Amino acid sequence: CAADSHDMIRVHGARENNLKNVQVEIPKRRLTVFTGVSGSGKSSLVFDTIAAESQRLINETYSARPEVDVLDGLTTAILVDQQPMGTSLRSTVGTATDAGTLLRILFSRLAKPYIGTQKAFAFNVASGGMCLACEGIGSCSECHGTRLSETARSAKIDGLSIADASAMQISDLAAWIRGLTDPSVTTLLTVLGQTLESFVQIGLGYLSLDRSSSTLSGGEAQRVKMVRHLGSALTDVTYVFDEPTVGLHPHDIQRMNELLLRLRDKGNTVLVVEHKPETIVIADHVVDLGPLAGTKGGEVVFEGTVEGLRASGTVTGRHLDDRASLKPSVRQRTGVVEVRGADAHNLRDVDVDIPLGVLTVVTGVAGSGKSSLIHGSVAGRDGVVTVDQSPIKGSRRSNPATYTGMLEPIRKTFAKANGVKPALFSPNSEGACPTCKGAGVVATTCEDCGGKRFQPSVLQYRVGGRDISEVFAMPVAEAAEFFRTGEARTPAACTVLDRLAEVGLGYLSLGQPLTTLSGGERQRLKLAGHMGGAGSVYILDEPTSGLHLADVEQLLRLLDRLVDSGKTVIVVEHHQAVMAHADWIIDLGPGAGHDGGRVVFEGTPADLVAARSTLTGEHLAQYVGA
Amino acid sequence: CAADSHDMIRVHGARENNLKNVQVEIPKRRLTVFTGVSGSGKSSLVFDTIAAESQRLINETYSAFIQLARPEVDVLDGLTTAILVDQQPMGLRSTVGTATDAGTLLRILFSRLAKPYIGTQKAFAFNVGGMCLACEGICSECHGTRLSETARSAKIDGLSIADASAMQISDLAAWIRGLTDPSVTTLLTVLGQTLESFVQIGLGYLSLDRSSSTLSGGEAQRVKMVRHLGSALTDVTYVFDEPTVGLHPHDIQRMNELLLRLRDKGNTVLVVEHKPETIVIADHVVDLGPLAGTKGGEVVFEGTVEGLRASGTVTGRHLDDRASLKPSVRQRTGVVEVRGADAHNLRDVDVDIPLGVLTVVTGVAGSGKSSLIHGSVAGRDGVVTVDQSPIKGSRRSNPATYTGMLEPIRKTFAKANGVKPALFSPNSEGACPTCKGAGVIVATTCEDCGGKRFQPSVLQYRVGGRDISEVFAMPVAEAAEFFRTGEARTPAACTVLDRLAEVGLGYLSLGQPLTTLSGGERQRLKLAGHMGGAGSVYILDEPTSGLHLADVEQLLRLLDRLVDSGKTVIVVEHHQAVMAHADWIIDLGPGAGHDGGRVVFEGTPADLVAARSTLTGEHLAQYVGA
Ligand SMILES: Nc1ncnc2c1ncn2[C@@H]1O[C@H](COP(=O)(O)OP(=O)(O)O)[C@@H](O)[C@H]1O
Ligand SMILES: Nc1ncnc2c1ncn2[C@@H]1O[C@H](COP(=O)(O)OP(=O)(O)O)[C@@H](O)[C@H]1O
Ligand SMILES: Nc1ncnc2c1ncn2[C@@H]1O[C@H](COP(=O)(O)OP(=O)(O)O)[C@@H](O)[C@H]1O
Ligand SMILES: Nc1ncnc2c1ncn2[C@@H]1O[C@H](COP(=O)(O)OP(=O)(O)O)[C@@H](O)[C@H]1O
Ligand SMILES: [Cl-]
Ligand SMILES: [Cl-]
Ligand SMILES: [Cl-]
Numbered sequence A: 001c002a003a004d005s006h007d008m009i010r011v012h013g014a015r016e017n018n019l020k021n022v023q024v025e026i027p028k029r030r031l032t033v034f035t036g037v038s039g040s041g042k043s044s045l046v047f048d049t050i051a052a053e054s055q056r057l058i059n060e061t062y063s064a065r066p067e068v069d070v071l072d073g074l075t076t077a078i079l080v081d082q083q084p085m086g087t088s089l090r091s092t093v094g095t096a097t098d099a100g101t102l103l104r105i106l107f108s109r110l111a112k113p114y115i116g117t118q119k120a121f122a123f124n125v126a127s128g129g130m131c132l133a134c135e136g137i138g139s140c141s142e143c144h145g146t147r148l149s150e151t152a153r154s155a156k157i158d159g160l161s162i163a164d165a166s167a168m169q170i171s172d173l174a175a176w177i178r179g180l181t182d183p184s185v186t187t188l189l190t191v192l193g194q195t196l197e198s199f200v201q202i203g204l205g206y207l208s209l210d211r212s213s214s215t216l217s218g219g220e221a222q223r224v225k226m227v228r229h230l231g232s233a234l235t236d237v238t239y240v241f242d243e244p245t246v247g248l249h250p251h252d253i254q255r256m257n258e259l260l261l262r263l264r265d266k267g268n269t270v271l272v273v274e275h276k277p278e279t280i281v282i283a284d285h286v287v288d289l290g291p292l293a294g295t296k297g298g299e300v301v302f303e304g305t306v307e308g309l310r311a312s313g314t315v316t317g318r319h320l321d322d323r324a325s326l327k328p329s330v331r332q333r334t335g336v337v338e339v340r341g342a343d344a345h346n347l348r349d350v351d352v353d354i355p356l357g358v359l360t361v362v363t364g365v366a367g368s369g370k371s372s373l374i375h376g377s378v379a380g381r382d383g384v385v386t387v388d389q390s391p392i393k394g395s396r397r398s399n400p401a402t403y404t405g406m407l408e409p410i411r412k413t414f415a416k417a418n419g420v421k422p423a424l425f426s427p428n429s430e431g432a433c434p435t436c437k438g439a440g441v442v443a444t445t446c447e448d449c450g451g452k453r454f455q456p457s458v459l460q461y462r463v464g465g466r467d468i469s470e471v472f473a474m475p476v477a478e479a480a481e482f483f484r485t486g487e488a489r490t491p492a493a494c495t496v497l498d499r500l501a502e503v504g505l506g507y508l509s510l511g512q513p514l515t516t517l518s519g520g521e522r523q524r525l526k527l528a529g530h531m532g533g534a535g536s537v538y539i540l541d542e543p544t545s546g547l548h549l550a551d552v553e554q555l556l557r558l559l560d561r562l563v564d565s566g567k568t569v570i571v572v573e574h575h576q577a578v579m580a581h582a583d584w585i586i587d588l589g590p591g592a593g594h595d596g597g598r599v600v601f602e603g604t605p606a607d608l609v610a611a612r613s614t615l616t617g618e619h620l621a622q623y624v625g626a
Numbered sequence B: 001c002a003a004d005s006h007d008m009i010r011v012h013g014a015r016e017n018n019l020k021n022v023q024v025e026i027p028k029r030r031l032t033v034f035t036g037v038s039g040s041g042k043s044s045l046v047f048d049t050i051a052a053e054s055q056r057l058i059n060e061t062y063s064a065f066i067q068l069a070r071p072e073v074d075v076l077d078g079l080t081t082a083i084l085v086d087q088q089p090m091g092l093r094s095t096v097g098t099a100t101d102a103g104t105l106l107r108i109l110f111s112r113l114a115k116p117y118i119g120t121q122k123a124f125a126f127n128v129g130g131m132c133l134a135c136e137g138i139c140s141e142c143h144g145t146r147l148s149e150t151a152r153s154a155k156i157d158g159l160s161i162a163d164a165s166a167m168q169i170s171d172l173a174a175w176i177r178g179l180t181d182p183s184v185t186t187l188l189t190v191l192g193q194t195l196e197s198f199v200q201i202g203l204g205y206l207s208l209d210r211s212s213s214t215l216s217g218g219e220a221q222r223v224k225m226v227r228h229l230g231s232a233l234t235d236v237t238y239v240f241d242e243p244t245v246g247l248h249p250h251d252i253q254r255m256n257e258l259l260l261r262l263r264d265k266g267n268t269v270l271v272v273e274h275k276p277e278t279i280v281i282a283d284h285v286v287d288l289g290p291l292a293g294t295k296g297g298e299v300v301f302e303g304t305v306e307g308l309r310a311s312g313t314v315t316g317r318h319l320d321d322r323a324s325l326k327p328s329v330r331q332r333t334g335v336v337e338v339r340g341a342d343a344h345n346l347r348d349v350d351v352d353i354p355l356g357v358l359t360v361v362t363g364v365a366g367s368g369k370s371s372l373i374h375g376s377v378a379g380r381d382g383v384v385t386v387d388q389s390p391i392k393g394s395r396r397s398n399p400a401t402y403t404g405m406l407e408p409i410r411k412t413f414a415k416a417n418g419v420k421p422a423l424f425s426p427n428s429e430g431a432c433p434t435c436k437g438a439g440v441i442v443a444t445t446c447e448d449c450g451g452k453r454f455q456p457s458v459l460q461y462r463v464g465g466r467d468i469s470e471v472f473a474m475p476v477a478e479a480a481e482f483f484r485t486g487e488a489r490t491p492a493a494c495t496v497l498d499r500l501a502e503v504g505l506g507y508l509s510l511g512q513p514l515t516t517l518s519g520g521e522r523q524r525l526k527l528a529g530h531m532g533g534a535g536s537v538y539i540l541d542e543p544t545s546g547l548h549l550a551d552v553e554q555l556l557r558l559l560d561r562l563v564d565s566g567k568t569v570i571v572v573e574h575h576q577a578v579m580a581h582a583d584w585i586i587d588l589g590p591g592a593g594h595d596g597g598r599v600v601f602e603g604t605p606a607d608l609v610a611a612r613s614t615l616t617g618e619h620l621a622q623y624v625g626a
């Protein structure tokens, strides 16, 4: 029967970015994992081709296009990514979720005194719960950060205003809800109870509803969205995940896995981009991109089962069982950073010494307090370079060449060779495309210049047989060679280019818009940009995100060179390869939220592993084969 | 296999509007036809419940920046993405070319192939590209084409894009097929295919430059269907409202084949229909009834088509109804003389339309029926046009308001309570501050008043035991009696109420927002308003739209009373029961567009059937068993 015959998503002739005219056959209503080194093409295929085309086909039906030849059997795509859900100064976990609305309804139906409908409990409307002084923003002495008017806070259920309810952990909110007895609101209590418990089940019990949406990690944002999908009655949709193990402790990966398979078993296609073998191995189907990155990847080098992947001899197949060992010895501290009475968030008046001149890895379950400790007590101090995953400013107008400073010497080399002025090859050129400069105008290729960025007057000027648009289109790795010798020789470009290669970004194009970078990409770009000296204490939050096990060895060499040239490196991680490479571990716990906030271990990795006393130590001991 | 098990859309506890806690099980990837008399509840179930809930679940996944209340239903399981293929407009600067892929692809073809070169695809667009600066793309400079001189200078084989856009799609497809240039082999195939699909669906007579706002509901629906038939989306629920609208008897089978084509792509197809020739292709039937309004709202049959035939429901009993020709016809009392009619495709038509009788104007879509009637008759004295078009300010109106009865009712409420009429009006200070109409912004129930319309002190004032809120909630058929005798008696309301009953609108509520009326219902509403008044000739464009075969019998009694009281009734129709009942038929043809525009028959239905010499006659002959 024809109507029941469309059980595969079929791709033919896919060419977005580096993809080499690839083809795949993805089984609908199954979990497919997309593997391969970073820059191999995984997001080009899953996000910029499959999901982008589903989204365009949906968009074209509303009243109000990727490069690929055939895309057959597509369904609606919902992106469950690591982008924030709303970023306004008025978006919280509660405003982004059914929870917050249900809670406002409960309060309009049960709090005393009566004050109105659900909207009297909301800070994103006035006349309305909004505090009039801060306009529901909260930065504010009149509402003490709660965002609500005195009236909105006066209406209470058993002693609790909605501000109190929103301030507690969701695990505590859930218990508060379960203890409410009142026959008027029974179904509402059941419905709110079940959403809250679902937060608890995915492991977000430590968050509060009042948490500002922009302070969530990429992984927390993604998991908050997942609560909605897991509760949704939609079926036959394609849910698309970007590394859903990000921000999860080793103890918590199996729980994420079961969530992904539960989504599938609801009758949905689940597409996951992952590097972690513990998630790869749950797949019904595998698509492996490679062989390597950029112009050296973009091919489907394996497609089949997980057992087929193991036997395939691809770069992913060959590393799938790679598991680090501990160092034979650790470095000796050249000093101490004294942390005294750390009490941000859940931290239980923490005293700890962090060793200088070594690689310290800060570990513990999500919500345990790692970032609260490190950001709160170390980040503000002098000489301390925080390199994180946050967006870069003016990203629409910038690219890796501009952000790092290499573009200027390149423009000088073009100008000197061709008898013209530097500025002719800039965003403010006479010859710049009127409608972009960036070659794109969310981001699609600018039609006026075709992506070339400049009018043909500027493009006639060449160095090494290449115009300036061809240069912007080069990967860092190719540019590293292009600018090394001959007419184009440009030593100050070479300097930055080698650093970008060394942090693992050899695949990025010099002109790639910065808004297309992942958080781990942004962080490695910044890392490269700070390399060259300036300060002596580097803080890196989860620098392995987006890295295949091949790539992590290279980051670990880079961190070793950093420490050995006399710097302190402090890394917050769940990646056990990084843990295994540490000189010193500080483990937070025991659990998340008020079950955590304490240093449960401080010591060498070998002592951690010998004890097996903490969740981190237990997992790490299994990981190193102990 | 749990993932493959969600193969039914399951509705339990549906209570929107008149629905009586209904339940159905709709098979995915099958065609389900929803049948029943007008007002039985079909659209309540299909559009306000099934499709609305799919759309809500999709919308809640969109970011807050991007951005619908749950219908009244208990469980709605197995839902997929839903796309409405309704008779709503697509409009302006909006043409069939701008609304379709065809237009975009045409512009691209011209940018690649046309000489002289003038630019990229947007140099050929009239949304500053190709736009005529004098009229701003809307004219002595561009002669109505909307395009600058430069835009029109660019030629392929002598034709500009204005010429290609002015032609019928059917001639454009042949032209496109005639072009041979290796540069664009692939675009000619893609363009030629989308154009062929316009031809196949029967819209070959349209031109790409036809303004979107001037399409009929049927044409608009078929333009949308071209896009769906070409879409690679699968596992979508496509929801159609009466897709036989505006189709000639000859063209029904082709629309059936396209609906089944859409299913066979791997999609659920939901269709609301009254035409037996389409009903009988269904995989599954859901029949609403027994009758309309409070007498409906139940699922009175669900199952197979053969089941429907045996069922004894109203639908089942009428499935095989074929009207017969009248044994005699009325004699004209005069003639409307049409001379030289040359609107659109009309070939200088001379025709006499008889006065004092029921004339039915027939012929294939695009033959020129509306060009003739609208261009040559609708101008004249004592001619009332009663069409399906939207009514002014419908957002703030309802049947009670539109017909003038709401003010007499407020006076009745005022006198009987020693208050004044304005307390009960939209400009009252007791009216809900954010509505009056009991919904906001499409149409959702208002939170402030909870759908009540007025504060609870206004609803203290009653007549016949009913507050004003309850009066707005009443069906016409109940209002008619409640206002006929007793302490709420209001004669002026009864007069209007009875008129509404007689045009088949007994099920409408008095406060029903006018934006919820279908095209047919608006037409019949306007007809009730005109029936008192002064005209002697009435023009009705497709008044069977939205009518079950049971409701069409009651329409024909009404039309017979209209004519028998001395009025001329001219009806444009494809419904063969109406043609069989006529005094006189004017048939346009032979075909559509430049193959149409001539009167190919004029005479009694009997003489049409005996000649059996046009498409309409051949079909009417088969319809009456000749
Ligand atoms: N939006 C884009 N514009 C230009 N080049 C891009 C863009 N996105 C990715 N690339 C490049 O395409 C290649 C593959 O990238 P991606 O598919 O992001 O890899 P992965 O997801 O496997 O890390 C890389 O060389 C990358 O720099
Ligand atoms: N901006 C914030 N506002 C309020 N509470 C926060 C904020 N950031 C973190 N928390 C809370 O502090 C506790 C520790 O979280 P965090 O330091 O982010 O843990 P980790 O970094 O180990 O995952 C958690 O219970 C978390 O919900
Ligand atoms: N949006 C609405 N608000 C109030 N009443 C409505 C609305 N839509 C339909 N109705 C009423 O509900 C009943 C069911 O109508 P509907 O589902 O439109 O019937 P059908 O689609 O079978 O013609 C009718 O009595 C109608 O007047
Ligand atoms: N507004 C318009 N602008 C240009 N052409 C039109 C317009 N309305 C109709 N036509 C053309 O006139 C011809 C007859 O159309 P129409 O009168 O609407 O036929 P019918 O009413 O029989 O379906 C068709 O080829 C159609 O494309
Ligand atoms: Cl940190
Ligand atoms: Cl620069
Ligand atoms: Cl038939």
Ligand SMILES: [Cl-]
Pocket (backbone or CB within 6 Å): B313, B314, B317
């Ligand atoms: Cl009957």
Ligand SMILES: [Cl-]
Pocket (backbone or CB within 6 Å): B419, B420, B423
């Ligand atoms: Cl009053």
Ligand SMILES: [Mg+2]
Pocket (backbone or CB within 6 Å): A043, A044, A516
């Ligand atoms: Mg990417």
Ligand SMILES: [Mg+2]
Pocket (backbone or CB within 6 Å): B043, B044, B516
């Ligand atoms: Mg309706």
Ligand SMILES: [Zn+2]
Pocket (backbone or CB within 6 Å): A131, A132, A133, A134, A135, A136, A138, A139, A140, A141, A142, A143, A144, A145, A147, A148
């Ligand atoms: Zn405030």
Ligand SMILES: [Zn+2]
Pocket (backbone or CB within 6 Å): A433, A434, A435, A436, A437, A439, A440, A446, A447, A448, A449, A450, A451, A453
């Ligand atoms: Zn440009």
Ligand SMILES: [Zn+2]
Pocket (backbone or CB within 6 Å): B132, B133, B134, B135, B136, B137, B139, B140, B141, B142, B143, B144, B146, B147
């Ligand atoms: Zn003009």
Ligand SMILES: [Zn+2]
Pocket (backbone or CB within 6 Å): B432, B433, B434, B435, B436, B438, B439, B446, B447, B448, B449, B450, B451, B452, B453
């Ligand atoms: Zn209101």
